[PDB]
Amino acid sequence: LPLDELRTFAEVLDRVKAAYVEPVDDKTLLENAIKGMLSNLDPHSAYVKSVKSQVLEPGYAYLRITQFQVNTGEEVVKALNQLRKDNKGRLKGLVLDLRNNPGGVLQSAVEVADAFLTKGLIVYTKGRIANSELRFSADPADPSDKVPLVVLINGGSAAAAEIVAGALQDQKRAILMGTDSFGKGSVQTVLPLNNDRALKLTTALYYTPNGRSIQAQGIVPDIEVGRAKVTQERERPQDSDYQLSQALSLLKGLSVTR
Amino acid sequence: LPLDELRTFAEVLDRVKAAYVEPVDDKTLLENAIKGMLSNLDPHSAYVKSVKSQVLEPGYAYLRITQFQVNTGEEVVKALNQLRKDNKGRLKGLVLDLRNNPGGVLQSAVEVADAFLTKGLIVYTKGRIANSELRFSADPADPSDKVPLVVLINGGSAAAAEIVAGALQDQKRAILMGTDSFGKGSVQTVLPLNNDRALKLTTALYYTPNGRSIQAQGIVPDIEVGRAKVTQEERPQDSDYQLSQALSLLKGLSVTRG
Amino acid sequence: LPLDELRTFAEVLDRVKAAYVEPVDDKTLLENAIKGMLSNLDPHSAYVKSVKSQVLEPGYAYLRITQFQVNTGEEVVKALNQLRKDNKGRLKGLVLDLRNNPGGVLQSAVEVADAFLTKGLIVYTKGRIANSELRFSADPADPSDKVPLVVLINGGSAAAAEIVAGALQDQKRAILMGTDSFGKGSVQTVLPLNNDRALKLTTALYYTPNGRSIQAQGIVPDIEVGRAKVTQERERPQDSDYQLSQALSLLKGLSVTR
Amino acid sequence: LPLDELRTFAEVLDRVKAAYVEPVDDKTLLENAIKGMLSNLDPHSAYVKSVKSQVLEPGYAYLRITQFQVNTGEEVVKALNQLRKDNKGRLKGLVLDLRNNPGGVLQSAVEVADAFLTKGLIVYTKGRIANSELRFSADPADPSDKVPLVVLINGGSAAAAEIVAGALQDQKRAILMGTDSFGKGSVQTVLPLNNDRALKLTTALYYTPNGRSIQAQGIVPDIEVGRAKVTQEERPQDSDYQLSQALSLLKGLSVTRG
Amino acid sequence: LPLDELRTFAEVLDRVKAAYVEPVDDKTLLENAIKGMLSNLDPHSAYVKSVKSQVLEPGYAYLRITQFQVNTGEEVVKALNQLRKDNKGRLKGLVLDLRNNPGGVLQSAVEVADAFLTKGLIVYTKGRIANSELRFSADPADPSDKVPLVVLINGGSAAAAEIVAGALQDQKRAILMGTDSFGKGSVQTVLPLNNDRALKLTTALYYTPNGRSIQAQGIVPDIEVGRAKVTQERERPQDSDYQLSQALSLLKGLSVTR
Amino acid sequence: LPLDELRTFAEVLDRVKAAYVEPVDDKTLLENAIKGMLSNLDPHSAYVKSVKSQVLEPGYAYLRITQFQVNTGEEVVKALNQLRKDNKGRLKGLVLDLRNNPGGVLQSAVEVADAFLTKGLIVYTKGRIANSELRFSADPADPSDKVPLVVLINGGSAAAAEIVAGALQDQKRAILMGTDSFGKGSVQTVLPLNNDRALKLTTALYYTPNGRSIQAQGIVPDIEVGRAKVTQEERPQDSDYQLSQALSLLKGLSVTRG
């Protein structure tokens, strides 16, 4: 309690209480001060099929995560086995479509990452609270069978999708291609107050295994690919999707080289 | 300063100071509380020839108010007399173009309105500061000579333009045509503080003779006419839809009134 | 009988009778002289549902007179009552469509005018014959119930339509809008001759209640409205007809003002 | 002047003088009777290098008559001999372009026709005035050397052009191609009157050797070919449809005639 | 046998036999020398309804020869009688469509020509072999009944079609129109060798009745007509075919003249 | 010269000399036999800065071979070192642009290939002439520093370009991308004759280290990528499809190889 800065604050409040057109009591002024202090501090502070899979070409398959629900992990692993069965053999390449993914259940994201990782860190949260610092490590099981995969990210890829993509990139397990990410990582917790009300505050932030903050740096793809049209000068979705076709061709070339 | 609720405010502030991700000192929190208390209360709170006239048709004339400057009143009356000289007789109809008018000198606004009014109120402000209340009533002289007029108002007509239009409508002196108005009918005074700083606060707001606040209600035209361009298959009504509509209304009103 | 001018005429006739390629007798030359004297004097001299009504909008109705037949008057009055019944109340505005109206029975036109007029003159014919001068006055009954109406006139509006429009305008009962009128008013009578034949001659002309000749001045609308297209910069026939939409909007504005 | 029918005429004139709306004196009525007697009888009654030639193909040549001037005959014969020199031998076919030819000097027309005729009539006029009859017969010399020719006639070919074309057709000397002709085959003489004025009257009209009047029948081509433009996927037949048709007809006629 | 030139040849052959990359024996070198000697000498040397007829307009008929098969002659004569029966009278004009005709049986071509010819030569082959010189004369029977005909030839008109067209043109029996001909006339005979193989050689060439070689000069139409579109400035196939329409109009004009 | 088959050849030649339409002497037949024996055997038989480099992205560089001149080797090594200096460190990927390369100095080709190879064969020629066999093996120095590279080949890449590309592919040193190559892998020597004339004969042909003939097989790229243009919605990969594909393949290969 500074008291002198509180004097300045109360003086401004009294001037407002005196001059404003419509009369205002002390309580509404205090509440507006609180709401604005939170608004000025942090914008987030206050006071259905998940997975679709398909074998797009012989040897090369496509797995899209529309959203991160609770069942999402089991569904991605189910789809992995299903794609292995559809190709009637081991897969030559996989495309993770994580674009247009707002986020969702963090644990489901970590288990989706666990389908591709056998060791190492996945994501960790850092803040100044005791119960904020949280680490997540990969289990020694990956239903992916080390399949080479390229992950697609758009601007509308945020939160859990961004966590998954950053984990897969920092582990050098996947090729990230597409445009940059929404760059938002935060964990708002609701804190209780002695008054009969509570306040929501960002208490910590997500960090990828390397250590880059998702909130600030975002996730930068290893290959930048904007939407574009190719003109030759000589179901099947890649005939209409430029980014998916590019990912498919990159996987094909990687398989040929290897 | 009621210390009992000050306990609640300081406790909320301390909880925020404790929980936020990146540390923030007391000074920035208090400053943001001030800025938000002003911001949450009021969006306005913080811490060229004026008139051009023309006779559109024999008997029907057009008077445009680009802006409200000091010369505006004198120029409006000069233009009124000049238009009476142009038609070589009394006018059958007049159009006040108050569209695209941000406002200007309030006294010039009351002078423009007073050119059309012989009695009654023009505008009055209401607020809680000592010397804010100012009323404006019409003097018993109108250079308009009781000509029937249509006033055109769009969205980009605010402040003094809205005072003039609202006075003309509530006094049942003119017919308002066009779309709705901006609705900026508030006055902001700069108040000084014991600290070497000041705050802008709305201290009063404008009211039309009826009693309707311009700040909220704005001024709603009697006939809604959106902007459009007419193409026949100088004379501005041949190109301006709203002006053509007002002119035709005045002509029909004159014919019926025989 | 000038005799000397007849000498000149007979001399020219004899020269023609002598020199022309194919021989011509005196009779055909005389007949051609007559036909040309009439042709040179006056071009008019020689020798099916009528009414459709509809309530276009709540309060505002539309009455078109395709042509002036004998039943036309009773049909317009029938339609007046029918439109009053359709609106389930008194009418706010009416549009008389008299454009594309060649004319027809004069008495039917005068009775159509009588549906809107309670007193005063309607039309009068003037000529130099005893039985040519004819006056027509309004009866004290108007099924219109003083409804404000706008009358539409095109270039193809002539004869009885022009009489109706001129009567309604000079009585200051209707608003005439659209383009100018065919400007034709005449009354050709057939006159008998001692020879077994007759000649048709314009014997008199129509005059509106004011006294303007319809044949020369035509009928000038109070508001000139050519065909045009409006472009917004933000059954139901007026959505396709520009003149009808303009008349509707003028009636709406007049109702709002009144 | 048969006074008995003059009674009928004067009585009709007096009835008209009595009945017409605006009064008219006897003089204007008599003058209009004169003007109409002439007008109703006859529409014509009231009160640059000439030739260009070219050899289109080896053996086939083209001769155009822009107008009929005095030099026209000499120039046509000069062009005939010159075209024989151009082909270095007798011609297989010739095209007379008489299209877009208003007419001109009649004697030049008979000279142009006489360049193709060795015997028979060319043109003769019939009328009822003393010295009108003029006949034109061919002399036993033709510089054309009996070359088969097609003559082209359009609507804008009148008077002397039609005389030439009709002579060539009725003498079975040429094949006419194109559309129909104007049909202006009448001569107007100015006749003087005892009054200081005169009248234009058609005094005779032209007749082709067959006996058909040019004024009414015109000249109808043996082959109807409308105007058109051909575009291949100088040589004017490559651009002119009618000329190309005439040229191809001449070529085929030459091949068959072997 | 020059022996010295054979020495030069054998010396070049031995140099080739020694230096070439892949080893080659004497036999393949000799065979390649033979094949190239023939290739360098002459490109041709080495080592289904036929007829469709229709009466296109009253009096004017169309006969197309798709190809020259054995039955072709009887079929053209059958079609001649059929067209005479269809028109219900003698024919005014006929169009032979020989364009897009590769050729075929020579005898069938000569009999097709015999349907239009009553005397004279048709085609004769000239070469330096005893049994090569061959003449073909017309029989005194023509089922055409002397009908005037125009023959159409394109660039893709060769061999027997070209023979027919040349015969009809040189006899001055038909009008050839269209573009030039493939210009190919040859008769390759297979000659036997003492070795168990044979060689095909052009042994003679075709000549039209005039004597022009078909192989070199080709067949030049009397009227050149490329594909084009006509634009008026005022089943039935000729409405779509320019060349056929031109041939039809030429036949019509020829009939009118005759 | 085996006279027994010479009998067959001379007999065939005499039969041709006898049967052909136009007479031909023995000399022209023998000359054509020579020209065809060479022509039927072999189509080739009868009787500017070289390198430009650029670093496309941090770590990834581009080296283009316009042509194979003498300076080419020195310039390629200079550019390699310069690109290492440009990236300020070892390169992650390199692109050899061998497209649109006709060939050039063979020794420069072996020098360009030797800049990437440390051991093994580069190219060897096989033929039947005494001094044709020339082999080229790599020296144990490679200025490339084992950088992974993709080589681009199109159809217009022949001769030395194909030698370089084939060496790089068969040594499993580079990944070939693009379309197939020209396939011109043959050497022509001019051989002199006892007559004052000479013959061009292919004396040997090129072979890649695997043993595949370049003349027939050409060089088939490991990844087929046709030419195309990309348009985003200097940096040449932003405009070149094949180069962009190679760059993205190199980037993905680098990420996987971590």
Numbering used by the authors:
A (entry chain B), C (entry chain B), E (entry chain B): 41 to 87, 191 to 377, 411 to 434
B (entry chain A), D (entry chain A), F (entry chain A): 41 to 87, 191 to 376, 411 to 435
Q: What does the primary publication say about this deposited structure?
A:
Therefore, unlike CtpB, which fluctuates between an active and inactive form in solution and can be activated by a protein substrate, the CtpA hexamer is locked in an inactive configuration and requires LbcA for activation.
Instead, it requires the adaptor protein LbcA, the lipoprotein-binding partner of CtpA, for activity in vivo and in vitro. Therefore, it appears that LbcA interacts with CtpA to assemble an active proteolytic complex, which controls the activity of these enzymes by degrading them. We show that CtpA alone assembles as an inactive trimer of dimers and that LbcA is a right-handed spiral that might wrap around a substrate protein.
